[PDB]
Design an enzyme around this catalytic site. Structure first.
Site, PDB file in Angstrom:
ATOM      1  N   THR A 139       9.324   4.406  -6.187  1.00 28.22           N
ATOM      2  CA  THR A 139       9.394   4.090  -4.736  1.00 28.22           C
ATOM      3  C   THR A 139       8.958   2.656  -4.553  1.00 28.22           C
ATOM      4  O   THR A 139       7.992   2.208  -5.159  1.00 28.22           O
ATOM      5  CB  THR A 139       8.491   5.015  -3.923  1.00 28.22           C
ATOM      6  OG1 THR A 139       9.156   6.267  -3.863  1.00 28.22           O
ATOM      7  CG2 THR A 139       8.275   4.543  -2.477  1.00 28.22           C
ATOM      8  N   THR A 140       9.703   1.935  -3.733  1.00 32.80           N
ATOM      9  CA  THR A 140       9.303   0.616  -3.300  1.00 32.80           C
ATOM     10  C   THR A 140       9.506   0.559  -1.796  1.00 32.80           C
ATOM     11  O   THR A 140      10.612   0.773  -1.300  1.00 32.80           O
ATOM     12  CB  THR A 140      10.116  -0.484  -4.001  1.00 32.80           C
ATOM     13  OG1 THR A 140      10.150  -0.228  -5.411  1.00 32.80           O
ATOM     14  CG2 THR A 140       9.491  -1.851  -3.744  1.00 32.80           C
TER      15      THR A 140
ATOM     16  N   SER B  83       5.604   2.916  -6.746  1.00 23.54           N
ATOM     17  CA  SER B  83       5.648   2.641  -8.184  1.00 23.54           C
ATOM     18  C   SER B  83       6.190   1.242  -8.490  1.00 23.54           C
ATOM     19  O   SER B  83       5.781   0.615  -9.466  1.00 23.54           O
ATOM     20  CB  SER B  83       6.490   3.698  -8.905  1.00 23.54           C
ATOM     21  OG  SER B  83       7.713   3.930  -8.230  1.00 23.54           O
TER      22      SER B  83
END
Ligand SMILES: *[B]([O])([O])[C]([C][C]([C])[C])[N]C(=O)[C]([C]C1=[C][C]=[C][C]=[C]1)[N]C(=O)C1=[C]N=[C][C]=N1
Ligand SMILES: *[B]([O])([O])[C]([C][C]([C])[C])[N]C(=O)[C]([C]C1=[C][C]=[C][C]=[C]1)[N]C(=O)C1=[C]N=[C][C]=N1
Ligand SMILES: *[B]([O])([O])[C]([C][C]([C])[C])[N]C(=O)[C]([C]C1=[C][C]=[C][C]=[C]1)[N]C(=O)C1=[C]N=[C][C]=N1
Ligand SMILES: *[B]([O])([O])[C]([C][C]([C])[C])[N]C(=O)[C]([C]C1=[C][C]=[C][C]=[C]1)[N]C(=O)C1=[C]N=[C][C]=N1
Ligand SMILES: [Cl-]
Ligand SMILES: [Cl-]
Ligand SMILES: [Mg+2]
Ligand SMILES: [Mg+2]
Ligand SMILES: [Mg+2]
Ligand SMILES: [Mg+2]
Ligand SMILES: [Mg+2]
Lengths: 233, 226, 222, 195, 212, 204, 196, 195, 196
Positions: E1-2, E131
């Site tokens: 995930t960003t 992440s």
């Protein structure tokens, strides 16, 4: 959470054209010790349902008391208790299934596997399974424990799908069940020779057979078997 | 895995399903589980696939050299002894569960072998995850003095029981008949009761459907003359 | 120690059409390496033109479906027999699932039906109640086998038009109900071949403006 | 130790390595050079478990220097990198494996090309335009993905390297006490004394 | 995930990826990681898919009730603190959340709060969460200024997600852009990374490492 | 922690009419971190092609080991090794490390130069041979590859048609795996010509 | 497993059930646990099937080689070879063996070798999981210098009870008679011994 | 969080607290104020587990402010410190204890004396001329033992505090991104904006 | 512990050893494991001494209160009260109890309640660690409708063997006779029962 102490092994069953058959042996094991030799594990409810139970015997006796109480409760303020408003197989099962799933959900299960066999009001064959996890399923043939691995393969050769049910007579069906019980005695180390069998027919009603024995056993060939490979004497 | 062995009048038959699995996935649909130790000594293997293959090849190799050394056709008890002592030495870590059968100058023989090195004798035997489904059939239909035809039928029926009822077994039935005074007939895909139905649709793509970046000829040939 | 969870195998598949929606599922029920039943229905008509399936641990699946069916009944009682829309059903199911956040229903839930514009709709859930509307979703054991095939053959992923070489994509033309059923049947035939927990039978529930139809097909029993 | 970076430009390879050495609670040193010259046109930076790093680096250094004397010839960066990989691939199945990650920056005098090889303690080798070990890549690769062009000068490489170190000094929790920068090109190995 | 969010001259930029994973298995490439709390408030999603969805839609119900009771738009500070106080009650139970609560009010101006399942609540100008947060930080920190145009700010956010989508294995799918002004947020489309990567590479001259 | 899924990657192989195809992705990573997009996993020794998935250090080591062995084979035998024979060599070599194995998933592909018969084969990390008529899969997205192959594949596909099928099988399987992708290569193999094609795919 | 060996006037008799189990599954219902290490030196095996087979095979080899050099070995000697293997490899073995043999000089002898590897010379011995349930019965009913027919009945009745109560025991009751007359094998089926 | 210091001089109490906030791998913020004003002449700095720190500080702040309004009177630093200690001593035997360490710097207007109290998460209170929490004391106490004089002016205290921060910036592994300094005296609480 | 209850023509007899152990130490060599819950309803206790005492005390209270309201309780009723405590508290209890009683209507009855909390009505019952060694003996020697003297001998001989083989059992053999005639206590010392 507990562990099962005094235990019962396989329950087996199948459908046939006019009804259902169910069977289970009369043993109460205490680990590897074959402790109790006169335990009835098929428990009839009325004249249209038989509940077969395997696993923990103390929990079985608890369930037996619940069913006995269920009959008493159904009769209360019920003029049609022995007719239209009698207990159906489907009613008895759904009740047990509810209890089993509730008990697993409180992390305190009834350590059993149960098969409810019977015939409904409209003549329809009823056969359904439930266990300590609350898992349920139905099939032309149903079996618990070792029966699942050894009995079902034999019983499925008689009734492989739904369309094989009308083509299966009560004589052929009982023959298959009795044979399966013999096979389980050869191969299950926690089984006994003595068993009980129950038929529920839409025409002839509930026939409950006690003190049956496994017979016509093949052992003679054992005399020829010597050593574990090279030994001749 | 379902593997069986059945004795009969003048010899012995062994059979097996053709399914190999890695967890819940089928790795091979038409796997060959009947192994040849020597021309008239065959064995079926359950458990770890690489181990059953490897331990069979090794003993089969040493059996061949032994046969040449002694000028005698190999015996089943020799294969049995060499297999058990090897497996015992490795304390069960070599995961080979074998049904060993064959004919030799002593007669027809049928044995089972477990990974820890223990052996058993019998007229009918079954091994693997579907051994209970198969043993149910064998315990129901087995008799003394079976013919060749009756033993093949019983062996395949016992595998079928594994195929249909055990999720660890499936696809086809392989058989190997070993009759006294005859060549051993290896019947690969003796039954084929699991052909896939025609698909509803063809998934052949139009040419040019996939996007390409580069093309190049690969040189597989050796260094050229001139 | 007592383990309150189990795995009953199985696989399910929902596809949304232009004016229809299908929700398919195999009829096999298992534990470990044994079959419990070759025909144990897994997809259910819940009323209000909504079909549902909760795949994974069957005891939690049956519990959830049973409680949603119950929620539909009480929705009618409390709101003057109003039809429960597919989007409303989806949000209600989120709260059923999240209600047991710290002792989850161990299932992969999929529902299907028509939205309020009549167009096909499929919603997908995780065990603890997150959800998302989708055009396509496979769930359960063989979900990893089926989804990629559906990315390729439903959404024409990685496909382009001949002659252009990667420049022009294959246009996203709509699929008929007959065309979708073909893709569902092939998806399960393929899944049965390579996954030991899939087989016996395939049951498809089709949803249109006219109602809920059923189709059944045989699958390999090994 | 902590952060080691590498970047291959037009005509050279640039390695940057942190100066800090920390044993537990204290920073014992702030001027440590985490690199060894293997040959006149090949430099190896390293980072991993204490002791093992220097022991491994000097061991490789000794072996390459031995080869140089025996043959009176310098091995290609590719050849040296393959030797190093094999030693680590041998090490990973030993009684006690070398816990060391390395970057090998060299200039191949035959092909007239700079070359950068990234090798981890398992013996995983890859040739790259730019590389890193540990958590360094997590911050720096996005910048390098954007700015790197394969035809940059050495000065443009150092500027792109400063942008990497600035990001690390902003977002990394640990104080790595700056970096020692070294350049590898056709003329050999030299240290940038002001960075 | 960003997921990222940053304050600037034109308000706030919010940018997120679309990928959801179960181990190495890519469960979804079409996930909506930005929650529209109301026409003025946005929430970002990172960590537990369900926790974030459930409690951020719940947050919207609490914000609606605030402005029904107080006849006034809820402050970003108050909205963020409702969520942080809630998750603090559940601390230890195992909730998994990393969120930015983004909004624009008269009294506060553009405001971003980082809210987290360990109970952390932080006000700030730039935040990256997930992440692939380190990758996105690289592009942001080197290119960020207060004096960015809405057009350039939108691109920087888009580009920062792309950077992380490339390198981080648990990020990707597509990019959702939002631009938050005082009259509300404005959606700026779904951008497939498969098409965006090649477009940016060609036009920007970046990613020379990759062949195309 | 699990060695077979630290680096990631996939390989797939297929047969066609008088031809075979083998394909692989190009990713090498350190768990979540993508490290390299040029890590090819298909190697060849003469006309015999070998793909290897799994732990990257062992992929490299085994390639170097089989190059070593096939080069000695050729010197002594005075001919190139054939696919059937090479398959046995791979199995032998893997099983000798029975209790300290290489963490890999090899795949063999090639056409026998004498018979002309297409040939593919797969292995587990310790030597067991899977010799399929249709297709072989390997790597972190093997489940995905099984699903694609089992639906998309039909027998007796022409070389150019087979290319499309195997490419779509790889691409769509890789896109559902976090540790695979970052580029792809396909090898089309006929009796005396071998074409190599790099595929355009999403870089996330 | 239910195994026993009993000395009597004319020699010694070994007895055993025929059940081999993997958990609750009966892997073999017609097993032969009475095995031959020499012409008139046999043993009963309990514990691991693999271990006890491997041991018995090694002993048979040792006694075959002993015989070729020094002539017929004593039962005591056979027991010592069993002991040496069981004691020295006690960490890696799970084997409970009863050794029984007939000399002309020493007549019938019985040696029991439990898990540890110790040796115990006894008039009769019982072992295996099912032996626990017949300690009371066997102690009360054993007499020295019984006849062949009495000893067969003693073993038949004893193992019958052991089989009845122990799930790990069952199938047929195999017996082997060791006397000056020779070696006799006996088998008794369920229909016979269950009604006792 | 990380480093919090305190020093009591002649006529004031000086608290210094780091600005960094790190969640795992990244430094999310470099301007965080780890302190709350409890009353006009009482300041509390804090450090511990994420979330708990601010939740505890604001909870104490609310309680003291409530007392101030109810009685129209400011509690003495000693009284406030005792209240805080009891809350932590209550907390340590709870289901989930507050994982927070604090320093309380106040100026007692009755006695005209500055006062510094160090309290840990167990509820361990000590009055001190200078104090610290975590690993901060390990570096700083030796310097304070040497230089500290009680008649120190506020300017001499800030210089001695700079010497402490310099040592920390030299020998501590973590980059705590400098400190926010606040002074508590007879005129109240103010922040030193350049440090 | 070696405990047993046996029905016979005139009623029922309970039997028990007198050994209580903490590991290998005999904490009490003259223990009384035959305990009274009602005038002619007694029980044998095995397992935890604390648990079985606590249970027996609670049952005696319940039956005393039952008697005050509804008159003398049946043996079946007493067994049900034991079961209810043992079943519902199965997680926290270690108790193996044999309930034995004499009615005039039902005569001698024996109910055994193992660990799980299940109930089993039997002609005779055995329990405790030492019972394992006499399953064979008791099954072979039990007959229905025995005399008092025969039943005393059956119990005396059975527990003698259980004591002989089980280290957890020993001391004196206590017995309690329940008939229409009343309640009789019997004791048998080592010198007597060891020579059997
Ligand atoms: B059968 O189920 O025993 C079957 C027969 C085999 C000898 C061909 N065994 C297997 O399929 C085994 C199961 C297994 C899984 C995991 C560990 C050990 C055994 N399969 C394999 O050995 C296997 C798995 N993947 C690739 C190749 N072989
Ligand atoms: B992202 O990776 O944090 C993402 C954000 C979420 C809001 C969509 N989370 C996930 O993909 C998580 C796994 C995860 C990966 C990396 C870091 C943290 C968490 N997935 C799930 O929570 C999940 C739950 N059920 C099904 C599928 N995925
Ligand atoms: B007997 O039950 O001890 C028996 C004697 C053996 C020599 C045939 N042993 C077994 O059946 C053992 C298991 C066991 C049961 C009870 C006590 C100790 C051990 N079985 C095996 O060793 C075995 C089981 N399945 C396959 C191969 N070997
Ligand atoms: B008997 O051995 O089961 C006996 C029966 C008890 C009612 C007097 N139990 C004990 O002696 C137990 C230990 C035990 C031995 C064997 C099986 C189960 C339990 N002893 C105690 O409970 C005990 C020991 N020391 C002091 C107090 N209580
Ligand atoms: Cl054996
Ligand atoms: Cl007591
Ligand atoms: Mg099957
Ligand atoms: Mg709140
Ligand atoms: Mg990525
Ligand atoms: Mg303190
Ligand atoms: Mg004693």
């Amino acid at each position: 959470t507990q562990q099962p102490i005094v235990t019962g092994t396989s329950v087996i069953s199948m459908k046939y054209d006019n009804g259902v058959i169910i069977a289970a042996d009369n043993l109460g094991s205490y680990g590897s010790l074959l402790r109790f030799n006169g335990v009835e594990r098929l428990i009839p409810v009325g004249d249209n349902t038989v509940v077969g139970i395997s696993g923990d015997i103390s929990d079985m006796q608890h369930i037996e008391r619940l069913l006995k109480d269920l009959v008493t409760e159904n009769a209360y303020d019920n003029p049609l208790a022995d007719a239209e408003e009698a207990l159906e197989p489907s009613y008895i099962f759904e009740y047990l299934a509810t209890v089993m799933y509730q008990r697993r959900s409180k992390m305190n299960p009834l350590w059993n596997a149960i098969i409810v066999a019977g015939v409904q009001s409209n003549g329809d064959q009823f056969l359904r399974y439930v266990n300590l996890l609350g898992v349920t399923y139905s099939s032309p043939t149903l079996a618990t424990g070792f029966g699942a691995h050894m009995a079902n393969p034999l019983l499925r050769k008689v009734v492989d799908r739904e369309s094989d049910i009308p083509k299966t007579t009560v004589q052929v069906a009982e023959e298959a069940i009795v044979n399966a019980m013999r096979v389980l005695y050869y191969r299950d180390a926690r089984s006994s020779r003595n068993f009980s069998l129950a038929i529920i027919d839409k025409n002839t009603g509930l026939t409950f057979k006690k003190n049956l024995q496994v017979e016509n056993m093949k052992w003679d060939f054992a005399k020829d078997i010597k050593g574990y490979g090279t030994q001749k004497i | 895995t379902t593997i069986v062995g059945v004795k009969f009048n003048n010899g012995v038959v062994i059979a097996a399903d053709t399914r190999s699995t890695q967890g819940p996935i089928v790795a091979d649909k038409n796997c060959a589980k009947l192994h040849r130790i020597s021309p008239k000594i065959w064995c079926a293997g359950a458990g770890t696939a690489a181990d059953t293959e490897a331990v069979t090849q090794l003993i089969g190799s040493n059996i061949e050299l032994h046969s040449l050394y002694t000028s005698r056709e190999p015996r089943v008890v020799s294969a049995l002894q060499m297999l058990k002592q090897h497996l015992f030495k490795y304390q069960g870590h070599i995961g080979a569960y074998l049904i060993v059968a064959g004919v030799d100058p002593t007669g027809s023989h049928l044995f089972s072998i477990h990974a820890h090195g223990s052996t058993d004798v019998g007229y009918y035997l079954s091994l693997g995850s579907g051994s209970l489904a198969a043993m149910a059939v064998l315990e129901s239909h087995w008799k003394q003095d079976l013919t060749k035809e009756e033993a093949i039928k019983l062996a395949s029926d016992a595998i079928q029981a594994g195929i249909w009822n055990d999720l660890g077994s499936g696809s086809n039935v392989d058989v190997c008949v070993m009759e006294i005074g005859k060549d051993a007939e290896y019947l690969r895909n003796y039954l084929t009761p699991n052909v896939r139905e025609e698909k509803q649709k063809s998934y052949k793509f139009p040419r040019g459907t996939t996007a390409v970046l580069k093309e190049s000829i690969v040189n597989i040939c050796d260094i050229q003359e001139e | 120690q007592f383990n309150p969870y189990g795995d009953n195998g199985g696989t399910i598949l929902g596809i949304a059409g232009e004016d229809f929606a299908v929700l398919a599922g195999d009829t096999r029920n298992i534990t470990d390496y044994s079959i419990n039943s070759r025909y144990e229905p897994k997809v259910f008509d819940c009323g209000d033109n909504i079909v549902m399936s909760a795949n994974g641990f069957a005891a939690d699946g049956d519990a959830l479906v049973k409680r949603f069916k119950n929620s539909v009944k009480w929705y009618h009682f409390d709101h003057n027999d109003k039809k429960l829309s597919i989007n409303s059903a989806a949000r209600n199911i989120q709260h059923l699932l999240y209600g047991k956040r710290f002792f989850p229903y161990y299932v992969h839930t999929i529902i299907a039906g028509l939205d309020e514009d009549g167009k096909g709709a499929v919603y997908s859930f995780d065990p603890v109640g997150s959800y998302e509307r989708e055009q396509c979703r496979a769930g359960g054991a063989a979900a990893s086998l089926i989804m990629p095939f559906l990315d390729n053959q439903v959404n024409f992923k990685n496909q382009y038009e001949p002659g252009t070489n990667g420049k022009v994509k294959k246009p996203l033309k709509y699929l008929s109900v007959e065309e979708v059923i073909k893709l569902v049947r092939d998806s399960f035939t393929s899944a049965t071949e390579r996954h030991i927990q899939v087989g016996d039978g395939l049951e498809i529930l089709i949803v249109t403006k006219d109602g809920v139809r059923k189709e059944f097909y045989e699958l390999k029993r090994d | 130790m902590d952060i080691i970076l590498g970047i291959r430009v037009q005509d050279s390879v640039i390695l940057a390595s942190s100066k800090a050495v920390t044993r537990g609670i204290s920073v014992l040193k702030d001027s440590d050079d985490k690199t060894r010259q293997l040959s006149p046109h090949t430099l190896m930076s390293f980072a991993g478990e204490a002791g093992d790093t220097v022991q491994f680096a000097e061991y490789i250094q000794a072996n390459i220097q031995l080869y140089s004397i025996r043959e009176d010839y310098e091995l290609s960066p590719q050849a040296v990198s393959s030797f190093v990989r094999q030693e680590l691939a041998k090490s990973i199945r030993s009684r006690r494996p070398y816990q060391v990650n390395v970057l090998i920056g060299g200039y191949d005098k035959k092909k007239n090309k700079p070359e950068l090889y990234q090798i981890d303690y398992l013996g995983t080798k890859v040739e790259l335009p730019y590389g890193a070990h540990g958590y360094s890549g997590f911050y720096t690769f996005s910048l390098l993905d954007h700015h790197y062009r394969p035809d940059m000068t050495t000065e443009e490489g150092l500027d792109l390297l400063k942008l990497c170190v600035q990001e690390l000094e902003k977002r990394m929790p640990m104080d790595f006490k700056g970096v020692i920068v070294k350049i590898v090109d056709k003329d050999g190995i030299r240290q940038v004394d002001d960075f | 995930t960003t997921t990222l969010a940053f304050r600037f001259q034109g308000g706030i930029i919010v940018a997120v990826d679309s990928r959801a994973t179960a181990g190495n298995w890519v469960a979804s490439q079409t996930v909506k990681k930005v929650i529209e709390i109301n026409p003025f408030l946005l929430g970002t999603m990172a960590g537990g898919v369900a926790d974030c969805q459930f409690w951020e839609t719940w947050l919207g119900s609490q914000c609606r009730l605030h402005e029904l009771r107080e006849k006034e738009r809820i402050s970003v500070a108050a909205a963020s603190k409702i969520l942080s106080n809630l998750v603090y009650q559940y601390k230890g139970a195992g909730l998994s959340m990393g969120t930015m609560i983004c909004g624009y009010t008269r009294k506060e101006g553009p405001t971003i709060y980082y809210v987290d399942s360990d109970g952390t609540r932080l006000k700030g100008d730039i935040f990256c969460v997930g992440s692939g947060q380190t990758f996105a930080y690289g592009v942001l920190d080197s290119n960020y200024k207060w004096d960015l145009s809405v057009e350039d700010a939108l691109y920087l956010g888009k580009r920062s997600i792309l950077a992380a989508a490339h390198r981080d294995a648990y990020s990707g799918g597509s990019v959702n852009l939002y631009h938050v002004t005082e009259d509300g947020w404005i959606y700026h489309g779904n951008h497939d990374v498969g098409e965006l990567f090649w477009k940016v590479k060609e036009e920007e001259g970046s990613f020379n490492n990759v062949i195309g | 922690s699990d060695p077979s899924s630290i680096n990631g990657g996939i390989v797939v192989a297929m047969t066609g009419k008088d031809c075979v195809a083998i394909a692989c992705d190009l990713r090498l990573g350190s768990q979540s971190l993508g490290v390299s997009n040029k890590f090819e996993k298909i190697f060849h020794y003469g006309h015999v092609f070998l793909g290897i998935t799994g732990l990257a250090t062992d992929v490299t080591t085994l390639n170097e080991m089989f190059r070593y062995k096939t080069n000695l084979y050729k010197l002594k035998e005075e001919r190139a090794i054939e696919p059937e024979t090479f398959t046995q060599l791979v199995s032998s070599s893997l099983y000798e490390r029975r209790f300290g194995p290489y963490f890999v998933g090899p795949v063999v592909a090639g056409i026998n130069s004498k018979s002309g018969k297409p040939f593919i084969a797969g292995f587990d990390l310790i030597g067991c041979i899977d010799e399929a008529k249709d297709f072989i899969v390997s790597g972190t997205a093997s489940d995905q590859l099984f699903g694609m192959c089992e639906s998309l594949y039909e027998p007796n596909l022409e070389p150019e048609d087979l290319f499309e099928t195997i490419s779509q099988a790889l691409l769509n399987a890789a896109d559902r795996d976090a540790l695979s992708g970052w580029g792809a290569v396909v090898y089309i193999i006929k009796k005396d010509e071998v074409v190599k094609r790099y595929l355009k795919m999403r870089q996330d | 497993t239910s195994i026993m060996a009993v000395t009597f006037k004319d020699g010694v008799i070994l007895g055993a059930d025929s059940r081999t189990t993997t958990g609750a599954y009966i892997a073999n219902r017609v097993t032969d646990k009475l095995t031959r290490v020499h012409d008139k030196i046999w043993c009963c095996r309990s514990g691991s099937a693999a271990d006890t087979q491997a041991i018995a095979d090694i002993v048979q080899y040792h006694l075959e080689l002993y015989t070729s050099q020094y002539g017929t070995p004593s039962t005591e000697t056979a027991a010592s070879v069993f002991k040496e293997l069981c004691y020295e490899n006690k960490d890696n073995l799970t084997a409970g063996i009863i050794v029984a043999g007939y000399d002309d000089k020493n007549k019938g002898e019985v040696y029991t070798i439990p898990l540890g590897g110790s040796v115990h010379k006894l008039p009769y011995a019982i072992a295996g999981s099912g032996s626990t349930f017949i300690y009371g019965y066997c102690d009360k009913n054993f007499r020295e210098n019984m006849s062949k027919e009495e000893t067969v009945d003693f073993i038949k009745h004893s193992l019958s009870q052991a089989i009845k109560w122990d799930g790990s025991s069952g199938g047929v009751i195999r017996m082997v008679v060791l006397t000056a007359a020779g070696v006799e094998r006996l088998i008794f089926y369920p229909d016979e011994y269950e009604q006792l």
